[PDB]
Amino acid sequence: KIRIKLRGFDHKTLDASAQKIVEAARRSGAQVSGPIPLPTRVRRFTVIRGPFKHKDSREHFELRTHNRLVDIINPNRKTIEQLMTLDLPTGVEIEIKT
Amino acid sequence: ARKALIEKAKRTPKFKVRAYTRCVRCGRARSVYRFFGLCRICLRELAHKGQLPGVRKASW
Amino acid sequence: PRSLKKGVFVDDHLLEKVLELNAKGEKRLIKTWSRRSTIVPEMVGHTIAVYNGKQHVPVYITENMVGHKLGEFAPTRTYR
Amino acid sequence: GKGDRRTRRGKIWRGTYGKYRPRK
Amino acid sequence: EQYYGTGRRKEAVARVFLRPGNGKVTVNGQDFNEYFQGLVRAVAALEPLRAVDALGHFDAYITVRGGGKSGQIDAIKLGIARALVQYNPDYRAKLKPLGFLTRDARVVERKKYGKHKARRAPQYSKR
Amino acid sequence: ARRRRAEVRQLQPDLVYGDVLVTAFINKIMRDGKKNLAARIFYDACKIIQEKTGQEPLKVFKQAVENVKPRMEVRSRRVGGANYQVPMEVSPRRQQSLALRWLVQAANQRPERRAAVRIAHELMDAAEGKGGAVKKKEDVERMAEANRAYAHYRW
Amino acid sequence: GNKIHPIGFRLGITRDWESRWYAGKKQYRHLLLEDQRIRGLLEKELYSAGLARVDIERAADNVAVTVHVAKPGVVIGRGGERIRVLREELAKLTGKNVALNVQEVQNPNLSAPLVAQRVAEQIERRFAVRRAIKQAVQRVMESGAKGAKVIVSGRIGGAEQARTEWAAQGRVPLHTLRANIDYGFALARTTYGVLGVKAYIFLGEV
Amino acid sequence: ARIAGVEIPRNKRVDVALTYIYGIGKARAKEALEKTGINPATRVKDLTEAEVVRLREYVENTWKLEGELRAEVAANIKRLMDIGCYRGLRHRRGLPVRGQRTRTNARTRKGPRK
RNA sequence: CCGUUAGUUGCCAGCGGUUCGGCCGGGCACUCUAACGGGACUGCCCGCGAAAGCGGGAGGAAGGAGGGGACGACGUCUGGUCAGCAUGGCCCUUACGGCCUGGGCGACACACGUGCUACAAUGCCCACUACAAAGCGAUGCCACCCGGCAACGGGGAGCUAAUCGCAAAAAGGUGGGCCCAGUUCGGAUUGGGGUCUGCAACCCGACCCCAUGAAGCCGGAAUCGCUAGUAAUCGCGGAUCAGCCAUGCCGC
């Protein structure tokens, strides 16, 4: 039974990733275990917009982590290659565990 | 252009007590957090451009 | 007296000098610098230069007032 | 008050437990 | 044999579930005025019962928590009402009037450029 | 209102008497929000009613009301190179709201050492005809009007 | 004296993160750090063929690096010499080399930044700057565009007293967050000091 | 109960008693109410000497406060005020010993506005 | 406001085990949640009207531009922008530039600025009781037990981070102490104990405890904030951070 985490930035990177891995490993594992999201985590930051003295020019934005925890049951060999070398996105990374 | 003080990295804490924070871009050791290590400005401005990974403007 | 703290801690910065030198006696003021100390024991009855910010005034310490956070034994302002 | 520091209000604000609130 | 009614608003979630029974209410644990301690707040999660009468023929079980007492209590109320929706899905002239319709939309909005209380700009002085 | 009434927002009756007057009043007792202790004193006071005075809370609240609610008073007009003190029929809406507040406040004035005590004290005395609140009322009243000749000016 | 940043205006709309990659806590920072060492020594050595933009991408330990210009010649070098001292030298700033990704565009009339560097340098050479923006704009939108709104600021190619000047054709609702447009500014060499320039070409959007 | 400074505790428990004496009250009433052993609920109006003497006695050698509080306060403040220390420095004038900043705001010690 | 996809969070709306904490299995619809499109276009019934559109009503998740965000067009001000970075020119250099030892920008007879806490019983004091929230935690948040008047000191478990470390949310609830004084208020300043980042913490720190406990019992002429979940009030976290004068700023 395999656990996985694709923690990503773009809200299309996690999509290409979990998509290719859950649908392609749908001819191998236990057909996968649905890309369970996770409450996409948010980190906010604000800063003065008007350089130097201006306790009012600022504003803000943020950086965060969207999380997709795909997962596939029945370690049925074949699965390892319907995702492990048949991937396609770019704005995340292949986190695999068990 | 405060060249003479670009010593911030030779660390020589020589008593942790001295090595000090800083903004990698526009120097300014004033407000220089971490994950960014920038002056609120060098910072926020280059971010503005956006060649500063994922991070995106706020709304709500 | 004066212990209280023991050994006469001095934040090493001022302790090292305090000790052993306490051998050949004194000579007075050894222009101290990291007054972050909590003066102590042997430090009873001696002279050192307390950096008042821009000057090295000469301070002489006595029994019942020795062991306490160095700093507060050398002023640092000037009003009225 | 929050400056009563010692008892209730005091630690309430200090954000301190201790002699007026076990660490839980 | 079963009528579910959900009521939630301002970060307080009161999921009310009623089924043929009597007049007991498990507030994700205890009962009504047990949990709503000396809370005139009690009566809040039962108005949707007053709707078409009887507060003694149905078994009341609720999954309620979050924000806090009131918010959750009321949420509970609107929920019970929805349970009423399920039960008698033809109760307009009762479920609308002393009725209900949506959460509420009025939560301590936001502080921005200071003034905290989103309006409370620092007061002036004496010039 | 830049042109439109900007309506009189309506309150959901009492959570102990299904009454609008109740609710408004308890808000008046209230503070920092504390709907709780607000309604609280409201009640304990009601206890004074039923106890210290057989007669019912309904009738006492109502009577005190009829007593403190104003009637005719004054404000001035800067219309003709001057502002004269002219009286007018102290509209119901307000009459209520403020004879209301008023009461609550004079009540605050009262002695005792307990809030429910105050509420009682005054509310009763009012209902009757005896006290700080409503008395202050009569004052604003007859006081107002002295500027009678001015009245015909219309407010 | 305000108005938000023509890219922030863009973010999740038209135009995004040139340096495309992720990371997270305790590392993203330095990650980008090396990135600027990059773009910097980068545009630095090759502002040469009048570059235009740099998208350093990271989907893994490598560092994409597709920079763009419209000058292919001196770009790859007679045959491919250029792309060599270039992609090689690369390692020098943090190893993990990258395939020197050369991207050339179709028409410097849609390229506002570029045209700016342009009429800009012009003003370097020293001449009719008002003319400069007038026509520069003219054509920049002209050869297809939905508007060329341009402006120049500081030290009006003269006068002890500095000033501003501007002109535009068509449409350029910089407003309508969603306007899909191209914005650029150029440094201002002239011994007047720093006398910046800016121009924005509206890229349709409907 | 007549103790040290005749700090008689009225319709108040033991704790509420001491607190009425020199350097007493909060934190002080707790320690006193504990030793003397008495219901802090007591209003204080019948403290039988039989029990008062117990707490009243031990409340002499190790407790003062009373005609002694000044001792550790007067003697302990006399040393730092005689040596180039600092603890007493802040008091070497009329500002705030604990803190604070000086220059502006400090009438608490300096005296009244001028 | 509604169905679309899906379920390690959340359901049981229907059980069975229940160790009855949703612990185990199980159910994906309901609450949860990222995601999708649909949802008043003054479109329809009644007024008015040449028209735009306002006014009445039902429908409902809601219009009347749903409440909240970002967007501040042309110029004004030669406003602010020496030490944010950039800069034209000017001056500069055994030095107007470099490093180090201390002071100091936290000196006070005073005035004004912004906040703290306060005079209290619709309160304070104590014990027991009942529930978020958007954030935060690796060489870091820190589990329970041992040292614990206390600050804290140790062992020490967890995560690896919607399941694990931060967190005790307070006002609310029930009884209990007080019955209106300068009081249990108030906690200055000087009364004591300790916790801690840091060497060192005089000057120039945060904290617990010991003694002391001042002014004040809502504050002149005057001056402020705020259309409703808002005013008020009560709390949690956040970057700067080995300690921090943060009662300041931010978000909830």
Q: What are the tokens at B52? A: 């500063």
Give the CA distances from residue G190 to residues B44, G101, G154, G196, in Å, rounded to whole numbers and listed in that order. 29, 34, 11, 10
Instruction: Transcribe chain F into DSSP letters.
Output: --SS----PPPP--TTT--HHHHHHHHHH--SS-HHHHHHHHHHHHHHHHHHSSS-HHHHHHHHHHHH---EEEEEEE-SSSEEEEEEE--HHHHHHHHHHHHHHHHHHS-SS-HHHHHHHHHHHHHHT-SHHHHHHHIIIIITTSSHHHHTT--
Q: Which of F20, F26, F35, F36 to mutate to test the interface with E (most CBs of E within 10 A)?
A: F36
| SS3 readout for chain C | CCCCCCCCCCCCCCHHHHCHHHCCCCCCCCCCCCCCCCCCHHHCCCEEEEECCCCEEEEECCHHHCCCCHHHHCCCCCCC
Do G40 and G135 have their domain in common?
Answer: no
Separation CA C50–CA C34 (nearest Å): 9
Tell which of G106, G135, G168 closes a domain. Answer: G106
H39 contacts H69 by C-beta, under 8 angstroms = no
G199 contacts G184 by C-beta, under 8 angstroms = yes
Distance from chain centroid for Cα G16 = 14
Distance from chain centroid for Cα H93 = 24
Question: Greatest CA separation found in chain B?
Answer: 47
Q: Name the architecture of domain C1-80.
A: 2-Layer Sandwich (3.30)
G24 touches chain A (CB under 8 A): yes
F49 contacts F60 by C-beta, under 8 angstroms = yes
Q: Which of H15, H26, H31 to mutate to test the interface with D (most CBs of D within 10 A)?
A: H26
In CATH, what number is assigned to the domain containing residue A11? 3.30.70.600
**Structural domain of G36:** 16-106
Q: What are the tokens at D5? A: 């520091």
Backbone angles phi, psi at A61, to 5 degrees: -150, -165
Separation CA F41–CA D24 (nearest Å): 34
- Looking at residue G181, the DSSP 8-state letter turns out to be E
**Structural domain of E106:** 1-127
What's the number of domains chain F is made of? 1
B55 touches chain A (CB under 8 A): yes
Report which of G128, G130, G129, G133 is spatially closest to residue G112, judged by C-alpha positions. G133
Q: What are the tokens at G163? A: 């000033």
F100 contacts F62 by C-beta, under 8 angstroms = no
Method: cryo-EM
User: Mind telling me how many Å the CA of D11 is from chain H's nearest CA?
Assistant: 14
CB atoms within 10 A of CB F100: 21
Could G21 and A91 be called an inter-chain contact, meaning their C-beta atoms sit closer than 8 Å? yes
Q: Is E19 exposed, middle or buried (0-12, 13-18, 19+ CB in 10 A)?
A: middle
Report which of F103, F106, F107 is spatially closest to residue F95, judged by C-alpha positions. F103
The answer to whether some atom of strand I lies closer than 7 Å to the beta carbon of H26 is yes
Q: What are the tokens at F144? A: 């107002």
What's the number of domains chain G is made of? 2
Chains H and A touch, using 3 or more CB pairs below 8 Å:
no
CB atoms within 10 A of CB H98: 8
The annotation status of B23 as a binding-site residue, yes or no, is: yes
Could B50 and G17 be called an inter-chain contact, meaning their C-beta atoms sit closer than 8 Å? yes
Helix, strand, or coil here: E108? Answer: coil
Breaks (C-N over 2.5 A) in chain D follow: none
D7 touches chain H (CB under 8 A): yes
Strand I nucleotides, any atom under 7 Å from protein beta carbons: they are 1, 6-14, 22, 30-35, 59-62, 66-77, 79-81, 84-89, 97-119, 121-126, 129-139, 143-144, 148-152, 161-162, 167-174, 176-180, 183-193, 198-214, 221-237, 239-242, 245, 247, 249-252
Instruction: Transcribe E48-80 into DSSP letters.
Output: HHHTT--SSSEEEEEEEEES-HHHHHHHHHHHH
Looking only at the bridges linking them, the beta strands covering E3-9 and C56-60 are unpaired
Chain E span 67-126 residues with beta carbon within 7 Å of strand I: 67-69, 72, 92, 96, 101-126
Q: Which residue is nearest to nucleotide I10 (CA to C1')?
A: E63
Could A9 and G22 be called an inter-chain contact, meaning their C-beta atoms sit closer than 8 Å? yes
Separation CA E99–CA A20 (nearest Å): 49
Give the CA distances from residue H100 to residues A81, H6, H104, H108, H114, in Å, rounded to whole numbers and listed in that order. 70, 36, 10, 11, 20
All residues at 6 or more sequence positions from H73 whose CB lies less than 8 Å from its CB, including other chains: none
What B19-27 contacts at long range (C-beta under 8 Å, 24+ apart), as own/partner pairs, is B24/G33, B24/G36, B25/G36, B27/B2
Enumerate the residues of chain G whose CB falls inside 8 A of the CB of residue B24: 33, 36
The residue type found at H38 is I
In CATH, what number is assigned to the domain containing residue E99? 3.30.230.10
All residues at 6 or more sequence positions from F122 whose CB lies less than 8 Å from its CB, including other chains: F64, F103, F106, F107, F109, F110, F131, F132, F133
Separation CA G103–CA G116 (nearest Å): 20
D8 touches chain H (CB under 8 A): no
Report which of G154, H1, B14 is spatially closest to residue C34, judged by C-alpha positions. B14
Do G92 and G118 have their domain in common?
Answer: no
Helix axis angle for F35-52 and F115-128, nearest 10°, is 50
G49 contacts G41 by C-beta, under 8 angstroms = no
Resolution (A): 5.0
Backbone angles phi, psi at F92, to 5 degrees: -55, -75
CB atoms within 10 A of CB A12: 15
Separation CA F28–CA F25 (nearest Å): 5
**Structural domain of A74:** 1-98
Separation CA G160–CA G193 (nearest Å): 12
All residues at 6 or more sequence positions from H45 whose CB lies less than 8 Å from its CB, including other chains: H10, H11
Separation CA G109–CA G106 (nearest Å): 9
Locate the chain A residue with the closest alpha carbon to B30: A52
Whether the CA torsion E114, E115, E118, E119 is positive or negative: it is: negative
- Looking at residue G25, the DSSP 8-state letter turns out to be T
In CATH, what number is assigned to the domain containing residue G96? 3.30.300.20
The partner residues of E66 in beta bridges, in order of sequence, read E12
Nearest CB among B35, B41, B57 relative to A51 is that of B41
Q: What are the tokens at G189? A: 């060499």
Do G111 and G92 have their domain in common?
Answer: no
Give the CA distances from residue G65 to residues A34, F147, G42, G79, H68, in Å, rounded to whole numbers and listed in that order. 34, 87, 10, 21, 81
User: Mind telling me how many Å the CA of A10 is from chain G's nearest CA?
Assistant: 8
The answer to whether some atom of strand I lies closer than 7 Å to the beta carbon of G200 is no
In CATH, what number is assigned to the domain containing residue F140? 1.10.455.10
Plot region of F79 (φ>0 → left; ψ -120 to 50 → alpha; else → beta) = alpha
H-helix or E-strand spanning residue H110:
helix H107-110
Domains in chain B, please, with CATH?
Answer: 1-60 (4.10.830.10)
C71 touches chain H (CB under 8 A): yes
The residue type found at C39 is I
Whether the CA torsion E82, E83, E89, E90 is positive or negative: it is: negative
HSE-CB of F108 using CA atoms within 13 angstroms: 9
Distance from chain centroid for Cα H19 = 8
**Structural domain of F94:** 1-155
Helix axis angle for F20-29 and F57-68, nearest 10°, is 70
Within-domain flag for G1:
no
Enumerate the residues of chain D whose CB falls inside 8 A of the CB of residue H27: 6
D9 touches chain H (CB under 8 A): no
Report domain extents, chain C.
Answer: 1-80
| Separation of G24 CA and I161 C1' (Å) | 14
Chain F span 22-61 residues with beta carbon within 7 Å of strand I: 27, 29-34, 36-38, 40-41
Nearest nucleotide to F108 (CA to C1') is I122
The residue type found at G48 is S
Q: What are the tokens at F14? A: 């009492």
Could A44 and B43 be called an inter-chain contact, meaning their C-beta atoms sit closer than 8 Å? no
Q: Which residue is nearest to nucleotide I61 (CA to C1')?
A: E102
The residue to which tokens 């200071």 are assigned? E114
Do G102 and G131 have their domain in common?
Answer: no
